Nucleic acid binder design. Structure first.
Ligand SMILES: [Mg+2]
Ligand SMILES: [Mg+2]
Ligand code: NA
Ligand code: NA
Ligand code: NA
Ligand code: NA
Ligand code: NA
Ligand code: NA
Ligand code: NA
Length: 175
DNA sequence: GCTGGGATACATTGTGCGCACAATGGGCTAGCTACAACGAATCCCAGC
């Protein structure tokens, strides 16, 4: 079940060209530019409970179809839970069962979702508390203020990080 | 901090390791086309 960093790196390199989903009988490949490593893996953590992947979906309707009909070529896996935005799989890798999580994020919300899925839980809690003090709500979908999305002139996770007012930290040192 | 996915009340079993969830069983009760029907609200796990 447990796996080291290089093990999960090999798993992501294997899966980067083997992700797809069934869309009304059509097998759709998931491009590697949309597969982003996240979670404890994006941090150079020595040991991994799981491998966390963020798939980027260009259109909104297809969000229903990616994870519920997710497919992997040539790999055995079980599904414990699966919905529109989150899915966990028990993949079989060399006679060991591994946990592999998939999360979806629209392209408009790429920096936010990446940010929410990269940093450690505690770092996220501290950031969201600091933003909430100023009447703001930050999540994987955007910045909100009085139950209203706040537009930001940003495109990457780093531009988000500075536009929001905190010091940038590469994923490793975030804590 | 903020969200996602899967059951939704109350007593009785099989596990692979005194345990814990999916799966039975039965008095109690609302309402009666001897029908049968939403979908938020809620809670408990899960993710970072
Ligand atoms: Mg993980
Ligand atoms: Mg109960
Ligand atoms: Na999806
Ligand atoms: Na997401
Ligand atoms: Na708001
Ligand atoms: Na504003
Ligand atoms: Na910081
Ligand atoms: Na009747
Ligand atoms: Na009848």
């Amino acid at each position: 079940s447990m796996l080291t960093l290089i093990q999960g790196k090999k798993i992501v390199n294997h899966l980067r060209s083997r992700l797809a989903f069934e869309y009304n009988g059509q097998l759709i490949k998931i491009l590697s530019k949309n597969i982003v490593a996240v979670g404890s893996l994006r941090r150079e953590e020595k040991m991994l409970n799981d491998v966390d992947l963020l798939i980027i979906v260009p259109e909104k309707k297809l969000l229903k179809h990616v994870l519920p009909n997710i497919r992997i070529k040539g790999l055995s896996f079980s599904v414990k839970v699966c919905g529109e935005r989150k899915c966990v799989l028990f993949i079989e890798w060399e006679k060991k069962t591994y946990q592999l999580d998939l999360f979806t994020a629209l392209a408009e919300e790429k920096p936010y979702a990446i940010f929410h899925f990269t940093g450690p839980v505690s770092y996220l809690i501290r950031i969201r508390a600091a933003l909430k003090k100023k009447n703001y709500k930050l999540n994987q979908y955007g910045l909100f203020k009085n139950q209203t999305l706040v537009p930001l002139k940003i495109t990457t996770e780093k531009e988000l990080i500075k536009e929001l007012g905190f010091t940038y930290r590469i994923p490793k040192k975030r804590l």
